Subunit: 224 residues, 4 copies
C-alpha cells in the first residue's frame, strides 16, 4: 500500500486479427519521459501530469483514471495534423504504479513505395478531407463536422519526424481524395474500398504505376 | 414419346451475381446451336437446340428420374465417348437436368465454367473507345467432362489475351484461376502508350465468375487503403 | 413526334458485379398497370399518374422526369415497412413512350433457410432498427433520424405477399439487431459484417444452427 | 571466425497482422532449443540456440553473401540430408538469413508455416472456461524442406482436432488449407451439449495466418448479411 503512485504508458488491447495504429505506433513512443498528459480520476477535472517524473497522492475499491495526450489547453473543437490519444486505467488505491492503456483517437497516415517500404523521395502527397471536428472529453471520441469543407492536408514522410493524423470520417470506395505532385505534375490517388475510419484505424498511401489505367475486379459466386 | 429441350441458367444464392445474369445461357445457346447431351452413364450425342427432339429410350439404365448432362459448345467425337484439355477465349457451359421419363420438356440448367471479361469506363458503362486492353493470364487447363469443371495448368506460363468490347459481340472468356492482389496482369494501350491495370484484391475465379476491367485516371499515382480494427 | 406520351416502368442500371434490390425485385413487379405514381418534369409539382392507363401532354431538347412510388400524400418524414422507389428519365419531347428508371430507396429484407431457399415456417423473425427518417423529394434519398430509437419490426415471408423494407442506416458487425421466436423461445440473429445500407441494398436473414456456438474467422497475410 | 544466431521474425506489410505478432518466434525458439540449419546447397545440421556458435567455413561454395535456412522444430536425420510429410498440432517454423562471412551475429527471420488457433470469448479476450472446442480439418500434408511451405493432402479426410486454450501454454497449429464460407468445421461441447461453430467467410489459410474461434450467443438463430451495391 503506497502513498503516491507513478504512471506507465501502455496500449489498449488490439484486434487479434487486425493491426491497430497502436500496433504500428506504440503509445510509449509518443508519450515518453517529460511529456505532459491531462489526467483525472472519474469525476474530477483534468490536471497536467509529467510522465516519468510526477507522482500523485492516492487521496473506493477500484479507481478509474482518464487521460488525454497531448494535454488539454463536456466537448471541445479539434483539427487534424497532430495525433490525439485517450487512455483509461482501473487501479486499486495503494498501488505503486498505474498503467494507462491508451487508444489513438485520430487516424495516422503512412506513405509506402511499391514494395511497402516507407517512402523517401521528393514527391508531395496530399489528402482532401474534413479537418475540423469535436472531441468528447470523457471518452476521447472525435466526430467530424459534417458541415465542414474538405481541406488539403500534406502527408509527412518518416524522415520529417512527425506523423500526419487525420480526424475519423468515412472515405467512400473510388473517392478521389488524394493527389501526388512531382515536378509540377499531379496525379490522383483514390480509395479502393470504403473506410469508415475510427479510433485505432490507420490509413496507407501506396504509390505505384500498378493501377495507371484502372483496376481489375471480379466476383466469385457459388452455384447450388 | 419424345422430349424437347429448353435452355435455362443454373442458380446461385438469391443475393449473388453470376455471369448468367449479364450473359444468359439462352443468349449463347440459341435455335440452331448444337450441344453434346447424355443421360447418366451414356455417351454424349449431338442435339440441335430449338429443332431436335430426343426419344425417351435414350436414358441408359435409369428409372423414375433421369439425369441429363450437356456441353456447349459441342464436344469432339473422341471426348463424347473422363477429362479433356482446354484453352481460353471461347466460353464453355455445362448443363444438367433431372426429368421423369414421359415429360414433354426437359430444362437444362447451364453453368458458365469459363470466366467472361467485361471492359467498363469509370461509371460502370461498357467501354466503347479505341484503346487496346490485354490480360496476362494462364490460358491452358483441363475440363472434367462429367461435371464441366475447369482447372488451370499450374505449370502453364501466363499469356497475353486481348479483351473484346461489348460491341464486338463476342465475350473474351478466361479459364478459372487465382489472381493475386497487386498482380500486374493488365495493360491498356492507346496511341502507342501503355498503362498498367492490376488487381486490387485476391480473386480466386471459378465457374459463374465475372471479371471487370474498370478504366479510369482515379489511381494514377497509387491507392489509398487502410485498416479499421474493431475493439470488441 | 407524338402529342401525348405513355410511361413504362424500368430499373436503374445495376452494379455489374453485385446484385441490387432491383435485380431481386424488378420495379415492373411493384409498379404494375393501375398503380399510381407521383410524377413531374423538372421544376414542376408532382401530380398523380395511373401507370398503363394515363397519358400526358408534351406541353427544350431533352426533358428530365422524376417519380415517386407509392404516390405522395423540399423533404418529408418517412417510416419503414412499405417500399419507396424513385425514378428518373431523360426524354425528347414528341417521344411516344417515356421509360422511368426506378431505384428502390428503402432496403428489402428477405428470410432464407439453411439452403438459401425462401423460409416458410412458423418462426417469428424481427429486427431492431431505426424506423423513422427523412426523404429528399427531389432525389429520393432517405436519411435516418439519428435521434430516433430502435424499434422492433417483424419481417414478412414470401407467402405474406408484402416485402418488409427498412430505412437506409449503418448496421455494425456483431450488432445484435435480430431475434427469432419459435414456441416462446427467442434466439439472437446478428450482423456478421458492417452494412452501410443505401438505396439498392438488400438485407438477408439466414436461419440455421451453423453458428450456434459462435464463429470461425482468420487473416491471410503475405510474408515479404 | 565463428558466428552466433539470433531469432527474429519475418516481415509482412506494415499494416498486416501475422501470427508472429501474437506468437513471436523468440518465444518458441528460446535458449536451449535445437534448430536444423544449413547454408545454401548444404545439409541441415543441428544448432543449439543461445549456446552454439557456427564456424564461418560451413557456408558451402558461397562468397560475398551467404544464405542460411532453418527449420524449427529440428528435422529427422533423413530429412536433414526435397520434401517431407507433416501433420497438424505442433507449430513448424522456417527461417532464412543473408549474412556476410565474418559477421559476429546472424539474424534468422522465421516465418510460421503452420496456422495457430486461438479461442476467444465475445470480447476478443482469451476464453478460460471448461467447454471443449474442436475443429474438423485436414491434418496431413507435405512440407518443402527448401522453402518451408506446407501444402495439404487434398485426398485427406477431415479429422477432429481439439483446440488448446491460451492458459494450456501450447498453441494448436493447423496445416494451411482452404476453409469455405458456412463450412461447419467447429464444435463446442459443454455439459454433454454440442453446438456448431462455422466459418462466416472463405479462408484460404497460408503461412503467417491465424485462426480465431470466437464464442458467443450472437448468432444462435442465424446471421444477418446483405448487399450494398454501388452506383458508379
Ligand atoms: Cl442465381
Ligand atoms: Cl510484419
Ligand atoms: Zn502492452
Ligand atoms: Zn490537435
Ligand atoms: Zn505489398
Ligand atoms: Zn509495378
Ligand atoms: Zn471487390
Ligand atoms: Zn474453348
Ligand atoms: Zn498457350
Ligand atoms: Zn474520376
Ligand atoms: Zn484491402
Ligand atoms: Zn431494364
Ligand atoms: Zn412508407
Ligand atoms: Zn448458401
Ligand atoms: Zn447446418
Ligand atoms: Zn474477416
Ligand atoms: Zn509436426
Ligand atoms: Zn490423419
Ligand atoms: Zn452478445
Ligand atoms: Zn458476405
Amino acid at each position: 500500500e503506497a502513498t503516491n503512485f507513478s504512471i506507465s504508458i501502455d496500449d489498449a488491447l488490439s484486434d487479434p486479427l487486425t493491426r491497430t495504429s497502436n500496433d504500428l505506433f506504440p503509445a510509449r513512443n509518443s508519450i515518453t519521459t517529460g511529456e505532459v498528459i491531462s489526467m483525472a480520476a472519474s469525476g474530477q477535472d483534468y490536471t497536467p501530469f509529467i510522465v516519468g517524473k510526477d507522482s500523485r497522492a492516492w487521496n473506493t475499491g477500484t479507481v478509474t483514471f482518464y487521460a488525454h495526450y497531448p494535454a488539454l489547453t463536456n466537448k471541445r473543437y479539434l483539427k487534424g495534423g497532430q495525433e490525439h490519444l485517450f487512455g483509461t486505467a482501473e487501479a486499486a488505491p495503494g498501488s505503486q504504479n498505474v498503467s494507462l492503456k491508451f487508444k489513438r483517437m485520430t487516424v495516422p497516415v503512412i506513405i509506402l513505395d511499391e514494395n511497402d517500404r516507407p517512402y523517401e523521395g521528393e514527391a508531395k502527397v496530399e489528402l482532401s478531407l474534413k479537418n475540423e471536428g469535436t472531441q468528447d472529453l470523457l471518452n476521447g471520441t472525435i466526430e467530424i463536422n459534417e458541415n465542414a469543407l474538405s481541406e488539403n492536408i500534406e502527408v509527412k514522410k518518416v524522415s520529417e519526424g512527425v506523423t500526419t493524423n487525420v480526424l475519423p470520417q468515412k472515405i467512400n470506395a473510388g473517392e478521389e481524395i488524394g493527389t501526388i505532385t512531382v515536378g509540377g505534375v499531379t496525379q490522383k490517388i483514390s480509395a479502393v474500398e470504403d473506410l469508415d475510419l475510427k479510433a485505432g484505424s490507420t490509413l496507407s498511401v501506396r504509390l505505384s504505376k500498378k493501377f495507371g489505367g484502372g483496376i481489375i475486379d471480379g466476383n466469385v459466386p457459388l452455384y447450388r
